[model samples]
Target: TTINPTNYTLLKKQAASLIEDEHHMIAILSNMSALLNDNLDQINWVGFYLLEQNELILGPFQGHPASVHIPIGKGVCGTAVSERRTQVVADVHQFKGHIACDANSKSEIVVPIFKDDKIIGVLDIDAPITDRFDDNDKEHLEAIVKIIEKQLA
Candidate 1:
């Protein structure tokens, strides 16, 4: 079934409820990953990559084990943080410097999360189908990140 973009409103509401009064970082990320993984479709992975000492380290994620460390500017997740923007890749293989944590992931979206004007990490989602993400997904996912940003503050 085609994912209705309007569903993001409910998704955001659900996320807000799940993270409410949760100040623990790991707990928040863990629940967020699980929430998106359960609610979103055609996805193989959902997670976060936290920035530490100029490198992206794997954080709470709902998927098979992923790359433990990704350098800034290396992969889609890394590039999002390095560029401080969102990346909506129709095909992961076509993306230069793509890191195949899961060989089966065909498309991806990565959004940078910030804390105090500095990038803190990224929310990364991967799918098993090409062109799984669009402008609407990008916009909504960014909105989701904004909510996460407030949690971190």
Candidate 2:
């Protein structure tokens, strides 16, 4: 009845190992999403959106339903994919063009997922409290995405 203690090490390692031999993107993403939901703390949403043509559409996620479509270069997730950078928003409300996937989500971090040296999608996580994500979180989450990216490559 307690949240998983995220020492950060095992989380990414487990994810990498899970998809080590599995090349199916859907299967990998689905399992990855589930793992993140089960492992990360203080997060209300753990989701993925795949870059399809001009936009990003839903992949697999663990959370209340969110925007099925996200505009590239627009919202936080959009900007993350468009710029190939990780976005750690302390307060989504303060971000220009921010649209709440979950109204109560106060903070978020979006990390770019890549394949063949190109962005494929992004990993989006939202927290219930402001300032929930910081530099350490960003670096660790990006490392998580890096682990995922290696599988794609």
Candidate 3:
């Protein structure tokens, strides 16, 4: 294991700069997904699932293919939106509503992205090992979305 801590200092700064002049949404999401892909470790998948028509529709992402849409309050993605909180599950089996696109995804994490008072979408990441996510991840990832939230605003 690497002894070095996962410093998100540069990661967050680059996000602000990358999204500074860019007025487009998808373009920003594309690079933001890439940043998380490169910064985070042991994640099998990473991407956005936009909330639309009362469903979590797939958006920009990086990994093997994934599910297209999920109904609200259903899967982990839905639960994130429903509960309005970051859902971190160590074992997929424990999450009965888990609808994983990656068959080998043993653990999962999802962060809700808000657009003002309304919920916009979510940032989902899957891991092949159990307990791959922790509070540190949730804290930093939540802050990462705050930057995105600001951009969206």
Candidate 4:
């Protein structure tokens, strides 16, 4: 499968159309994760981590084995949701409070997924290459999450 940065917009557009009308949040996230995993190049993992009772539990995903549950303020995924902010870490090891669920992950990006203007989950993506995700990548990924958020509402 040939994929690159420039094509993410097209992928996002396709994903938006696929999930324009789905109230079941899990189903929407599952397909959206698959869309990113299937289209993005050099992606190691793409999935959803939902805010479950103050913890970020693994939601539907399309990738290899992932941390089934992440406590709030634990790892990058947890910290992002706990703090209600976007985390674009270039190196997981460099993150003082990083949660290394997959040791192969070098870079990470977590986009908060909102529902009814409340943080419901996060769109987490990882790459094995250092500095794999930059500001532009974060913007595009967040754009995709925005689509997911709107569709879920």
Cα lDDT of all candidates, in order? 0.87, 0.84, 0.84, 0.80
Give residue 94's error in model 3 in angstroms: 1.7
| Candidate 1 CA-lDDT value | 0.87
TM-score per candidate = 0.92, 0.90, 0.90, 0.89
Model 3 weakest 10-residue run by lDDT: 1-10
| Predicted model with the maximum lDDT | 1
* lDDT tens per residue, model 1, 28-137: 99999998987888888899988999999999999888888999998888888878889899988877744544487889999998999999889999988889998988
Candidate 3, residues 1-153, lDDT tens digits: the string is: 332356688888877887887757788888999988888777789999999888999999999888798888878899999999889998976777445443778898999889878888999988877788888878888889998888888
User: 64-94, model 2: which lDDT tens digit per residue?
Assistant: 8787888999889999977888888888888
Kindly list the per-residue Cα lDDT of model 4 for residues 1-153, writing each as its tens digit. Answer: 333555875877798888876778877878777878878787788888888787888888877877688888877887887788999888878787445444768888988888886888888888877788878888888888787777777
Model 3 error, position 77 (Å): 0.3
Give the Cα error of residue 113 in candidate 3, in Å. Answer: 0.9
TM-score of 4: 0.89
In terms of lDDT, model 3 sits at 0.84
Worst 10 residues of 4 by lDDT: 1-10
